[PDB]
Amino acid sequence: MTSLEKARELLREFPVVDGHNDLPWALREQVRYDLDARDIAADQSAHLHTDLARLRSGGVGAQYWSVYVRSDLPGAVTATLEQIDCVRRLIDRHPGELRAALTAADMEAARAEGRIASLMGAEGGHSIDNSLATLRALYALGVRYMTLTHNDNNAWADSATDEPGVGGLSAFGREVVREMNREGMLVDLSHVAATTMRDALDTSTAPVIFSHSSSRAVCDHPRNIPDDVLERLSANGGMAMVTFVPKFVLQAAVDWTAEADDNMRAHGFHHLDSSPEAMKVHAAFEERVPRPVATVSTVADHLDHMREVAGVDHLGIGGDYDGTPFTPDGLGDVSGYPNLIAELLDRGWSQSDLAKLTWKNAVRVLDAAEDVSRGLRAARGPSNATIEQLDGT
Ligand SMILES: N[C@@H](Cc1ccccc1)P(=O)(O)C[C@H](CC(=O)O)C(=O)O
Ligand SMILES: [Zn+2]
Ligand SMILES: [Zn+2]
Secondary structure (H helix, E strand, O other): OOHHHHHHHHHHHEEEEEEEEEEHHHHHHHHHHOOHOOOOOOOOOOOOOHHHHHHHHEEEEEEEEEOOOOOOOOHHHHHHHHHHHHHHHHHHHHHOOOEEEEOOOHHHHHHHOOOOOEEEEOOOOOHHHHHHHHHHHHOOOOOEEEEOOOOOOOOOEEEEOOOOOOOOEEEHHHHHHHHHHHOOOEOOOOEOOHHHHHHHHHOOOOOEEEOOOEOOOOOOOOOOEEEHHOOOHHOOOOEEEOOOHHHOOOOHHHHHHHHHHHHHHOOOOOOOOHHHHHHHHHHHHHHHHOOOOOOOOHHHHHHHHHHHHOOOOEEEEOOOOOOOOOEOOOOHHHHHHHHHHHHHHHOOOOOOHHHHHHHHHHHHHHHHHHHHHHHHHHOOOOOOHHHHHOOOO
């Protein structure tokens, strides 16, 4: 059979656990959670990267649904609860296809019955409003990882896409990591500064993840992971879930985006300005310089290097579907994973290597978080510390 046929067979046995899909935010923004208007039991290819049929075609067996909210708007906690509610509603609406999962055991139970294990990951520490009790409440509601920052610093952690702030994690930031360890919530180091990555690795007694990050050695961008950090994963026990975002994974796209941003500033606009006037400037840039397009090969290049440095036991996949506007050719939506698996087969990845990449590493890591949590919950009570106490006024 072809490598694509083989890939599909392999995925039927050990499907993809995808680390980060932003369907909930997409539903919030497109239809304000009017789920009938974007029914994922129907074909949503006109509007979304994700629906149930495409998930199954793509060999997705578990999904961390992102409950991302904006850090630059007030009411982050309320919005996070709305995102969590969206995931809950999706699970309730589609019991034939989805199963809520809170534990590694739930993930295996879902796989045994042929349902997609549905987990939740918060994207940015702003979702807890500097409150450890709020962190505990998110865990109680089913959140199983939290990205420590999004694109901006918060009070206790530095983002890779902001200026240096506290220098990595503050004292309270370390306390957040300790509490995540006690609860059993995975520390997600996507988005965070390299300083923050190192501080989190120093502090965490549980395996950490990167829910959607690729390789900085392959493509120098702050959203990607440095080799020195990848090297620490085997000791930590964690895993880096490669992402598909073209402006992170393809050198030409990184360069293009930098030039686009410079061009915006040259016209007196902030690079993130979305006004009609700014859009005109950007359109003119894209007219003289077409947007470069990544491929499955681009993503495989990252995985090859990440495997060499981190080890095959410390890799996963985090597509960022419905969280980013552009995709590599062959990975245009959630049905695309078999194309990546086929490319890796062609590059000599073994069946057991690939079962680790798709399924086994993610289950091991969540089980490890649970194991560490058992020890810490037995050893001490929850923290009552405040950011004022630890970081000062
Ligand atoms: N939650 C998404 C941001 C978002 C998307 C839509 C409306 C608001 C916020 P993201 O963080 O998952 C995507 C981003 C790449 C990009 O911007 O393309 C990255 O991961 O670094
Ligand atoms: Zn992100
Ligand atoms: Zn996201």
